[PDB]
Amino acid sequence: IVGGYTCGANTVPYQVSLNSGYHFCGGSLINSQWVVSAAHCYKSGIQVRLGEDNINVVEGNEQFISASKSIVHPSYNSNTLNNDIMLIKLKSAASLNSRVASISLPTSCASAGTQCLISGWGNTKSSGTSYPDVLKCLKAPILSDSSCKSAYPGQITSNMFCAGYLEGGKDSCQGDSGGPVVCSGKLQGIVSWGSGCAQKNKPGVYTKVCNYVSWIKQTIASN
């Protein structure tokens, strides 16, 4: 996260870190046995880390659980990143409490102007790599479809939305992929891609979760 602030330990209880010997992506806890992240974060050997704040120190509240299965959306396209969503079932259920809690799925899509909270342990520099130890937060508004499509002509599908600042300086960045974009207490987006990080006129692009709620529900129901 570039231009963001330190969230404060466990203030984002649904945030998870996907770890394979190092933190590589973020994710969101939606129930005690399922996490939602981005299909481009897929790999085998994933350990899900819940209740985390400093990812390099065990400080208490952490729950490390291995992934039992990862379900990438069947229509995920790695060249366009369309349908960039994945579900991870945990080997055992997490113990939910005030530090580890699930986030609700939306009932409607959000409108441009809606303010959302984006969080993650990704890069905090737009030029160079500086990964933080603790969770960073950023408040960003959803942008109108015309500004999004004017910024990335031909690259935005109806399963994507832009959020951020066209003047530059604040954005999600590498290491944040798969994490949450929460607006009014509902999971509306998943960190998916962007051109560089925090560059002027190049906002972040996110998976539009409201288009997948029925798939998420049907898939969890059958697995």
Ligand X SMILES: NC(=[NH2+])c1ccc2[nH]c(-c3ccccc3O)nc2c1
Residues numbered 69-98 forming contacts with ligand X, rule: CB under 6 A: none
60 or 196: CB nearest Ca ion: 60
Instruction: Return the SS3 of 147.
Output: helix
42 binds, among Ca ion, ligand X, none (CB under 5 to 8 A by kind): none
54 binds, among Ca ion, ligand X, none (CB under 5 to 8 A by kind): Ca ion
Is 57 among the annotated ligand-binding positions?
yes
Helix, strand, coil percentages (3-state) for the chain, rounded to 5, are 10, 35, 55
Give the phi and the psi of residue 59 in degrees, each rounded to 5: -125, -5
- Neighbouring residues of 72: CB distance < 8 A, sequence distance ≥ 6: 39, 42, 86
- Number of amino acids touching ligand X (CB under 6 A): 12
How far, in Å, CA of 154 to CA of 171, rounded? 21
CB of 126 to ligand X, least distance (A): 8
Q: Which of 50, 173, 183, 209 binds ligand X (CB under 6 A)?
A: 173
CB of 142 to Ca ion, least distance (A): 31
Q: Can residue 52 be called a binding residue for ligand X (CB under 6 A)?
A: no
Q: Can residue 110 be called a binding residue for ligand X (CB under 6 A)?
A: no
Residue numbers annotated as active site: 40, 84, 177
Q: Which of 37, 83, 159, 172 binds ligand X (CB under 6 A)?
A: 172
Is 97 among the annotated ligand-binding positions?
no
Within 10 angstroms of residue 221's Cβ, the number of other Cβ atoms is 7
Asked if 136 and 124 touch (Cβ cutoff 8 Å), the reply is yes
Q: First-to-last CA distance in the chain?
A: 33
Residues numbered 40-79 forming contacts with Ca ion, rule: CB under 5 A: 54, 57, 59
Q: Which of 176, 181, 209, 216 binds ligand X (CB under 6 A)?
A: 176
Instruction: Return the SS3 of 150.
Output: helix
Q: Can residue 171 be called a binding residue for ligand X (CB under 6 A)?
A: yes
How far, in Å, CA of 80 to CA of 77, rounded? 6
Give Cα separations from 203 to 35, 40, 59, 193 (angstroms): 25, 19, 35, 9
Please state the residue numbers annotated as binding site for substrate: 171-172, 174-175, 177
Annotated binding site: 52, 54, 57, 62, 171-172, 174-175, 177
Binding-site entries for Ca(2+): 52, 54, 57, 62
